[PDB]
Amino acid sequence: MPSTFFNLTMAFSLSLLGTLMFRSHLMSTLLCLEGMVLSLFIMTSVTSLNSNSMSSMPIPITILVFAACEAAVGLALLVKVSNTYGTDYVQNLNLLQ
Amino acid sequence: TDNAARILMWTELIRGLGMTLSYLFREPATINYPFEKGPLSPRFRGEHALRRY
Amino acid sequence: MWFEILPGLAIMGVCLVIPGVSTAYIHKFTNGGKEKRVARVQYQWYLMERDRRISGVNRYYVSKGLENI
Amino acid sequence: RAEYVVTKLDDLINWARRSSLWPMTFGLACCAVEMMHMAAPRYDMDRFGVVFRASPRQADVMIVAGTLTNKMAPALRKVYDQMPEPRYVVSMGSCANGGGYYHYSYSVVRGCDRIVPVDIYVPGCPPTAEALLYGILQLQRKIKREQKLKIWYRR
Amino acid sequence: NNYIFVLSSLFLVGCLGLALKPSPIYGGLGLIVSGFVGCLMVLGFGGSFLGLMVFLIYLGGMLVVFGYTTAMATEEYPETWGSNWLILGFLVLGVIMEVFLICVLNYYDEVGVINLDGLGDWLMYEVDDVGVMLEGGIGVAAMYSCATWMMVVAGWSLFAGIFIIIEITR
Amino acid sequence: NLYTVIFINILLSLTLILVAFWLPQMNLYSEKANPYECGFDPTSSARLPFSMKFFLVAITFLLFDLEIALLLPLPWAIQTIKTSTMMIMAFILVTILSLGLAYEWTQKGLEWT
Amino acid sequence: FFINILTLLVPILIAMAFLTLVERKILGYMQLRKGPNIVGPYGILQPFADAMKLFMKEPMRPLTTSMSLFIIAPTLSLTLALSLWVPLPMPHPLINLNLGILFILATSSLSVYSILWSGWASNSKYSLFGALRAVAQTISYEVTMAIILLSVLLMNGSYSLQTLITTQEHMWLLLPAWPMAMMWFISTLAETNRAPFDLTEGESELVSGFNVEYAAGPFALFFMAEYTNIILMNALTTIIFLGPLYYINLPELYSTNFMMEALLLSSTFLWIRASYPRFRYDQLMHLLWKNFLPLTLALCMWHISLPIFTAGVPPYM
Amino acid sequence: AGRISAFLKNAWAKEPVLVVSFSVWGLAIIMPMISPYTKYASMINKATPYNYPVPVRDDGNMPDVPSHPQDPLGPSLDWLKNL
Ligand code: SF4
């Protein structure tokens, strides 16, 4: 259990390092954001399973629904960015300076 | 109700299914050509040949 | 005619009636004339674990009725 | 004896290719109708197990039908080169054999022999659907009587 | 026997590749490898509903996330994990950092995190043996009855999500 | 058990890929490995940007999949004791989903742009 | 157990090969052909020769493709298509999952992931068109299909697959749930890409879709996976909706009745393939979100109300 | 009052799927309010044994809580065994 939970904390620290930098695309950053969705589901379900607090099983479906709904909002936000630009890149977005 | 039973049960698609069900129970129109050869004509022009008297 | 498709459909029916009958017969031969118990809940798994510990030869399927008691 | 085992494995590997060979949903001509007439249920492809797939990566034999013009020539060689390595070519009809009409035209490649190898020349303007169904029988016996694993063995 | 630790190291590898950020078409492949890993982790832990539910919701979301990668955010010459050599050197550096982290983590702590014959024994804490409801399905069934505000706020999130997405994409 | 069935399926399909690749003869060249598009080389690169035409109906496919994962515990929520508030909650959220799809149906974004 | 693995995995391959044979024969007799008569006694040795042609032909290694996804998509496609059979009930299953309906749903979407990775990493414009109409096809089918499986398992209270046959011991679920049954048969046609709802394999608007650049070998192994999915969801519709009479003393009689019913359902599947014309990716999405999703939301409404109106609350096991 | 009937029959003839869906939706809304078996579902979900209802201590006080399990006292199930 503490090896699994500390490696999930390492996976969140790695995906923090992933979404806290930008290589070429905003969409790989949004894939890192959905990696945070999956990592928080696995962490919440592992916590509820080993604590056996089955009354808090409404919480990880609420994690998935709210975080994947804001992920879907950002996916169509990238659709509107590529519609209003024609490009997609991180360096394209320097017009607000 | 006849139009609303044509839609939502798709009974004309069931009618097309019955059409194909009527055609699957037929002895088929194929011939087995290396053993059952084709219908032709006496005027069927084919390989060129020189005749003889 | 209509009886032309039915040889290939009949060997299709034989070769697809063979895995369900084969898995029922291999479950009967695995569990010794009995069928394999299904653990939908934890109570059935503890029931099968207690069945193994009552039989004592690390076996679920053999069981101690009133011949031991 | 090992040569008997090699020739029976050669017959077992050529029986599959002579039976379940998969042609091409081609076109181009008058001769496109007679490929559709070999698909038609009087003289039938699918009785032999001869199936019109559309993709060149999935095809096994190319039925070149009719005229092969100068614009159609890279559009025939590109397709044959993207056929995978058992590639057999039927040439339906006299315009794919040697240019039946339009031999002396400005824009017909004079037969399909100028571009790809053709393993069987089926003549006519109609090859009848039974006549190149005979042609698929003769290619079927040709790659029955070919010897691949035998000359793999004696080499 | 070491199923959850082997799967969690594979989750660390998959989230490391997603963190090292390829073309996001390949990132969807790496994240769905991590999704299959997490579904198998919850099904090996005892959540028979939650892993397959995240596999259904994640395969169905990530399908059209993958379609948006290959439509909108694509590139003529993309970067996989083996294309760019700084990404490949960072991949082997993260792999040797992970095994150096476990090689220092079985030695520094002197507690039961990693032991070569004593890991996996502290995984199942307590499930009831004679009890009948121990799977995760009935607890998330209870949000219809006890925790009704969760379903109120999730249905309002999806209703507002439909209206918000029509207003974004208009 | 199921891990061993998944791994023997891996071994069977990997054995089928190995017998598909290594046993047939193969010579490969540049025109053979040229990508197929109708018998000519492609006009642009094949990973050139698609302008997506089902984008808002794609996002409501995603959000409808979140709703059906919300609705997945309901076969065990039918066994609950507070069945009046269970059926009222199921009624109000299927009414929410039908009203959202009715809004999208009236706004006519089901058609592509 | 491995004997059961081999004797369940070999004759399902023989069964889907004979399903391709009776596809060619049943479409032939529909289309007034005779079907592949000349090889074998009546056709039996045709699909063994089709596998022995398509696996002794070579595949491509194209420049434009990505080679790792090129070799890792079809090994997935055969693994997931042969692994949906392991929670299927029969009399007694090879593996009894606790909740197997979600496994069927998720790994059936993962088959479309194998198709979708083929469509992108095949790297043609035709293959990218096939990948995005796979995306639009699953946009059409998936929410509808899971609402159907949810709204029928409001009558059988667990997600288990043996609970379906102990629910359907007395009557079939065709008779209480025929508005579920017609749209489920249509939605599983949309799942398994058959000729009304076959886009993404295409063959009449585009050239091949997901297997444009996929030559023999991996195209054959996709073909293996696709017809394994055809006989799979035929058997799944057969067990879930017209599930036969179940006798605990005689499981083999029920298995013979299930296989006569499954060959009737597979003949209905190929009969639908050779009876209807083909959809469009716009009209497919249009009526599966317009003429299906209000109707299956209302059927979800009515089967939510069905443990309240007639007071049939289903048991757990 | 003919306009609503003409619109209903026109939608019934043209696009009857939304008419059938709204009718089945309103039937599922109103049919628990009509049916008398709504109150039996909570009776079923209460009277199922699902855990152990534990014995209680006694000082000779309550007569309704029985001692033998086959006593006539307590909540019986003649509305479930016979019905
Ligand atoms: S060979 Fe004859 S029939 Fe065929 S295209 Fe030429 S002219 Fe027409």
mmCIF file of N, CA and C in Angstrom, chain G residues 219-288:
data_model
loop_
_atom_site.group_PDB
_atom_site.id
_atom_site.type_symbol
_atom_site.label_atom_id
_atom_site.label_comp_id
_atom_site.label_asym_id
_atom_site.label_seq_id
_atom_site.Cartn_x
_atom_site.Cartn_y
_atom_site.Cartn_z
ATOM 1 N N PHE G 219 -4.435 -7.575 -42.365
ATOM 2 C CA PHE G 219 -5.804 -7.457 -42.884
ATOM 3 C C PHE G 219 -6.604 -8.723 -42.622
ATOM 4 N N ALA G 220 -5.961 -9.888 -42.761
ATOM 5 C CA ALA G 220 -6.592 -11.158 -42.418
ATOM 6 C C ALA G 220 -6.890 -11.260 -40.937
ATOM 7 N N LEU G 221 -6.045 -10.668 -40.102
ATOM 8 C CA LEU G 221 -6.225 -10.810 -38.668
ATOM 9 C C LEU G 221 -7.265 -9.804 -38.159
ATOM 10 N N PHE G 222 -7.380 -8.645 -38.833
ATOM 11 C CA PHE G 222 -8.567 -7.793 -38.705
ATOM 12 C C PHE G 222 -9.846 -8.466 -39.179
ATOM 13 N N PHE G 223 -9.780 -9.214 -40.279
ATOM 14 C CA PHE G 223 -10.918 -9.950 -40.821
ATOM 15 C C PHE G 223 -11.364 -11.057 -39.863
ATOM 16 N N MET G 224 -10.372 -11.706 -39.227
ATOM 17 C CA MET G 224 -10.577 -12.679 -38.155
ATOM 18 C C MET G 224 -11.310 -12.045 -36.979
ATOM 19 N N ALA G 225 -10.838 -10.861 -36.557
ATOM 20 C CA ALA G 225 -11.423 -10.135 -35.433
ATOM 21 C C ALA G 225 -12.823 -9.612 -35.743
ATOM 22 N N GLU G 226 -13.051 -9.175 -36.986
ATOM 23 C CA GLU G 226 -14.335 -8.602 -37.378
ATOM 24 C C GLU G 226 -15.425 -9.663 -37.450
ATOM 25 N N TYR G 227 -15.140 -10.813 -38.069
ATOM 26 C CA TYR G 227 -16.171 -11.847 -38.094
ATOM 27 C C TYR G 227 -16.291 -12.600 -36.772
ATOM 28 N N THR G 228 -15.239 -12.577 -35.938
ATOM 29 C CA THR G 228 -15.362 -13.033 -34.559
ATOM 30 C C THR G 228 -16.301 -12.121 -33.766
ATOM 31 N N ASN G 229 -16.244 -10.807 -34.031
ATOM 32 C CA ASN G 229 -17.203 -9.867 -33.451
ATOM 33 C C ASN G 229 -18.622 -10.057 -33.993
ATOM 34 N N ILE G 230 -18.758 -10.491 -35.259
ATOM 35 C CA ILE G 230 -20.078 -10.756 -35.852
ATOM 36 C C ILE G 230 -20.765 -11.934 -35.160
ATOM 37 N N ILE G 231 -20.057 -13.072 -35.048
ATOM 38 C CA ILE G 231 -20.620 -14.257 -34.380
ATOM 39 C C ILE G 231 -20.738 -14.032 -32.868
ATOM 40 N N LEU G 232 -19.897 -13.149 -32.323
ATOM 41 C CA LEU G 232 -19.896 -12.792 -30.915
ATOM 42 C C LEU G 232 -21.129 -12.001 -30.515
ATOM 43 N N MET G 233 -21.429 -10.928 -31.239
ATOM 44 C CA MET G 233 -22.593 -10.143 -30.871
ATOM 45 C C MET G 233 -23.889 -10.751 -31.386
ATOM 46 N N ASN G 234 -23.814 -11.659 -32.374
ATOM 47 C CA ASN G 234 -24.948 -12.528 -32.687
ATOM 48 C C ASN G 234 -25.285 -13.441 -31.514
ATOM 49 N N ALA G 235 -24.261 -14.070 -30.920
ATOM 50 C CA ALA G 235 -24.467 -14.918 -29.752
ATOM 51 C C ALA G 235 -24.841 -14.112 -28.514
ATOM 52 N N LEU G 236 -24.381 -12.859 -28.417
ATOM 53 C CA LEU G 236 -24.723 -12.009 -27.279
ATOM 54 C C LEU G 236 -26.174 -11.537 -27.336
ATOM 55 N N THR G 237 -26.660 -11.175 -28.536
ATOM 56 C CA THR G 237 -28.081 -10.881 -28.740
ATOM 57 C C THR G 237 -28.943 -12.119 -28.491
ATOM 58 N N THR G 238 -28.437 -13.292 -28.906
ATOM 59 C CA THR G 238 -29.122 -14.566 -28.697
ATOM 60 C C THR G 238 -29.225 -14.935 -27.217
ATOM 61 N N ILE G 239 -28.186 -14.664 -26.422
ATOM 62 C CA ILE G 239 -28.273 -15.023 -25.010
ATOM 63 C C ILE G 239 -29.068 -13.962 -24.235
ATOM 64 N N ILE G 240 -28.987 -12.684 -24.618
ATOM 65 C CA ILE G 240 -29.599 -11.652 -23.792
ATOM 66 C C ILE G 240 -31.086 -11.433 -24.096
ATOM 67 N N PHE G 241 -31.556 -11.715 -25.320
ATOM 68 C CA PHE G 241 -32.910 -11.293 -25.676
ATOM 69 C C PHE G 241 -33.836 -12.428 -26.077
ATOM 70 N N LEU G 242 -33.319 -13.410 -26.796
ATOM 71 C CA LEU G 242 -34.097 -14.591 -27.135
ATOM 72 C C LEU G 242 -33.428 -15.809 -26.520
ATOM 73 N N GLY G 243 -33.050 -15.658 -25.246
ATOM 74 C CA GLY G 243 -32.382 -16.682 -24.479
ATOM 75 C C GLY G 243 -33.266 -17.883 -24.213
ATOM 76 N N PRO G 244 -32.785 -19.076 -24.560
ATOM 77 C CA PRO G 244 -33.655 -20.252 -24.651
ATOM 78 C C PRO G 244 -33.981 -20.843 -23.284
ATOM 79 N N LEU G 245 -34.755 -21.926 -23.318
ATOM 80 C CA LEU G 245 -35.157 -22.623 -22.106
ATOM 81 C C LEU G 245 -33.970 -23.340 -21.471
ATOM 82 N N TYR G 246 -33.850 -23.201 -20.154
ATOM 83 C CA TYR G 246 -32.665 -23.624 -19.420
ATOM 84 C C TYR G 246 -33.055 -24.728 -18.452
ATOM 85 N N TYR G 247 -32.514 -25.921 -18.671
ATOM 86 C CA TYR G 247 -32.738 -27.066 -17.802
ATOM 87 C C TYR G 247 -31.431 -27.401 -17.100
ATOM 88 N N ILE G 248 -31.484 -27.510 -15.770
ATOM 89 C CA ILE G 248 -30.278 -27.804 -15.002
ATOM 90 C C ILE G 248 -29.879 -29.276 -15.140
ATOM 91 N N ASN G 249 -30.830 -30.164 -15.440
ATOM 92 C CA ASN G 249 -30.492 -31.556 -15.701
ATOM 93 C C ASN G 249 -29.908 -31.746 -17.095
ATOM 94 N N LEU G 250 -30.325 -30.927 -18.061
ATOM 95 C CA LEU G 250 -29.889 -31.048 -19.451
ATOM 96 C C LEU G 250 -29.356 -29.709 -19.941
ATOM 97 N N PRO G 251 -28.059 -29.436 -19.751
ATOM 98 C CA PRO G 251 -27.478 -28.220 -20.340
ATOM 99 C C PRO G 251 -27.170 -28.348 -21.822
ATOM 100 N N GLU G 252 -26.965 -29.569 -22.325
ATOM 101 C CA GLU G 252 -26.611 -29.754 -23.729
ATOM 102 C C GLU G 252 -27.805 -29.544 -24.655
ATOM 103 N N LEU G 253 -29.025 -29.828 -24.174
ATOM 104 C CA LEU G 253 -30.243 -29.533 -24.931
ATOM 105 C C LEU G 253 -30.440 -28.029 -25.088
ATOM 106 N N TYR G 254 -30.159 -27.280 -24.019
ATOM 107 C CA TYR G 254 -30.204 -25.825 -24.060
ATOM 108 C C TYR G 254 -29.094 -25.251 -24.934
ATOM 109 N N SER G 255 -27.922 -25.898 -24.960
ATOM 110 C CA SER G 255 -26.844 -25.445 -25.839
ATOM 111 C C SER G 255 -27.150 -25.706 -27.313
ATOM 112 N N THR G 256 -27.822 -26.824 -27.629
ATOM 113 C CA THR G 256 -28.264 -27.069 -29.004
ATOM 114 C C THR G 256 -29.358 -26.095 -29.431
ATOM 115 N N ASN G 257 -30.291 -25.771 -28.519
ATOM 116 C CA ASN G 257 -31.326 -24.778 -28.819
ATOM 117 C C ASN G 257 -30.739 -23.378 -28.974
ATOM 118 N N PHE G 258 -29.723 -23.057 -28.163
ATOM 119 C CA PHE G 258 -28.990 -21.801 -28.273
ATOM 120 C C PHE G 258 -28.192 -21.721 -29.566
ATOM 121 N N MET G 259 -27.706 -22.854 -30.076
ATOM 122 C CA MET G 259 -26.944 -22.774 -31.314
ATOM 123 C C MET G 259 -27.817 -22.782 -32.562
ATOM 124 N N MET G 260 -28.992 -23.433 -32.522
ATOM 125 C CA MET G 260 -29.988 -23.241 -33.584
ATOM 126 C C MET G 260 -30.500 -21.805 -33.610
ATOM 127 N N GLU G 261 -30.708 -21.216 -32.429
ATOM 128 C CA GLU G 261 -31.113 -19.820 -32.331
ATOM 129 C C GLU G 261 -30.006 -18.857 -32.762
ATOM 130 N N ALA G 262 -28.743 -19.190 -32.486
ATOM 131 C CA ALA G 262 -27.640 -18.328 -32.891
ATOM 132 C C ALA G 262 -27.336 -18.431 -34.380
ATOM 133 N N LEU G 263 -27.537 -19.602 -35.001
ATOM 134 C CA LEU G 263 -27.419 -19.663 -36.456
ATOM 135 C C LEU G 263 -28.596 -18.979 -37.146
ATOM 136 N N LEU G 264 -29.785 -18.988 -36.517
ATOM 137 C CA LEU G 264 -30.901 -18.172 -37.005
ATOM 138 C C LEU G 264 -30.603 -16.677 -36.896
ATOM 139 N N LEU G 265 -29.951 -16.259 -35.805
ATOM 140 C CA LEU G 265 -29.607 -14.848 -35.627
ATOM 141 C C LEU G 265 -28.478 -14.415 -36.561
ATOM 142 N N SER G 266 -27.516 -15.304 -36.829
ATOM 143 C CA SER G 266 -26.445 -14.980 -37.770
ATOM 144 C C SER G 266 -26.936 -14.974 -39.213
ATOM 145 N N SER G 267 -27.889 -15.858 -39.546
ATOM 146 C CA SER G 267 -28.559 -15.794 -40.838
ATOM 147 C C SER G 267 -29.404 -14.534 -40.970
ATOM 148 N N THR G 268 -29.996 -14.061 -39.865
ATOM 149 C CA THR G 268 -30.694 -12.777 -39.854
ATOM 150 C C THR G 268 -29.728 -11.602 -40.033
ATOM 151 N N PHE G 269 -28.514 -11.707 -39.476
ATOM 152 C CA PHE G 269 -27.483 -10.675 -39.620
ATOM 153 C C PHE G 269 -26.993 -10.552 -41.063
ATOM 154 N N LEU G 270 -26.653 -11.683 -41.684
ATOM 155 C CA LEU G 270 -26.242 -11.672 -43.087
ATOM 156 C C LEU G 270 -27.417 -11.416 -44.030
ATOM 157 N N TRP G 271 -28.633 -11.745 -43.592
ATOM 158 C CA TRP G 271 -29.857 -11.446 -44.321
ATOM 159 C C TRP G 271 -30.129 -9.947 -44.327
ATOM 160 N N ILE G 272 -29.845 -9.282 -43.209
ATOM 161 C CA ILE G 272 -29.943 -7.831 -43.112
ATOM 162 C C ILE G 272 -28.857 -7.159 -43.961
ATOM 163 N N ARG G 273 -27.655 -7.771 -44.001
ATOM 164 C CA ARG G 273 -26.550 -7.301 -44.849
ATOM 165 C C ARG G 273 -26.895 -7.380 -46.339
ATOM 166 N N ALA G 274 -27.528 -8.470 -46.768
ATOM 167 C CA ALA G 274 -27.942 -8.600 -48.157
ATOM 168 C C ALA G 274 -29.399 -8.225 -48.363
ATOM 169 N N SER G 275 -29.989 -7.482 -47.439
ATOM 170 C CA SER G 275 -31.289 -6.892 -47.702
ATOM 171 C C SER G 275 -31.292 -5.375 -47.704
ATOM 172 N N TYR G 276 -30.409 -4.720 -46.923
ATOM 173 C CA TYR G 276 -30.624 -3.276 -46.863
ATOM 174 C C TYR G 276 -29.509 -2.537 -47.598
ATOM 175 N N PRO G 277 -29.779 -1.352 -48.142
ATOM 176 C CA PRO G 277 -28.696 -0.480 -48.606
ATOM 177 C C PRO G 277 -27.979 0.180 -47.432
ATOM 178 N N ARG G 278 -26.898 0.873 -47.761
ATOM 179 C CA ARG G 278 -25.909 1.315 -46.791
ATOM 180 C C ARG G 278 -26.206 2.736 -46.329
ATOM 181 N N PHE G 279 -25.910 3.006 -45.058
ATOM 182 C CA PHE G 279 -26.115 4.312 -44.455
ATOM 183 C C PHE G 279 -25.056 5.321 -44.875
ATOM 184 N N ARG G 280 -25.119 6.461 -44.206
ATOM 185 C CA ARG G 280 -24.153 7.529 -44.328
ATOM 186 C C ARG G 280 -23.656 7.854 -42.925
ATOM 187 N N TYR G 281 -22.474 8.466 -42.840
ATOM 188 C CA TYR G 281 -21.917 8.861 -41.546
ATOM 189 C C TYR G 281 -22.648 10.057 -40.953
ATOM 190 N N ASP G 282 -23.327 10.848 -41.782
ATOM 191 C CA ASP G 282 -24.158 11.912 -41.241
ATOM 192 C C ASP G 282 -25.533 11.400 -40.829
ATOM 193 N N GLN G 283 -26.203 10.621 -41.691
ATOM 194 C CA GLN G 283 -27.546 10.116 -41.390
ATOM 195 C C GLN G 283 -27.539 9.037 -40.316
ATOM 196 N N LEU G 284 -26.424 8.314 -40.204
ATOM 197 C CA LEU G 284 -26.197 7.319 -39.162
ATOM 198 C C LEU G 284 -26.192 7.966 -37.783
ATOM 199 N N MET G 285 -25.378 9.017 -37.639
ATOM 200 C CA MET G 285 -25.316 9.837 -36.433
ATOM 201 C C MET G 285 -26.632 10.576 -36.203
ATOM 202 N N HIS G 286 -27.284 11.013 -37.296
ATOM 203 C CA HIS G 286 -28.524 11.789 -37.245
ATOM 204 C C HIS G 286 -29.678 10.985 -36.666
ATOM 205 N N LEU G 287 -29.933 9.792 -37.204
ATOM 206 C CA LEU G 287 -31.037 9.032 -36.643
ATOM 207 C C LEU G 287 -30.651 8.258 -35.390
ATOM 208 N N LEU G 288 -29.368 7.936 -35.166
ATOM 209 C CA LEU G 288 -29.025 7.338 -33.880
ATOM 210 C C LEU G 288 -28.902 8.357 -32.752
#
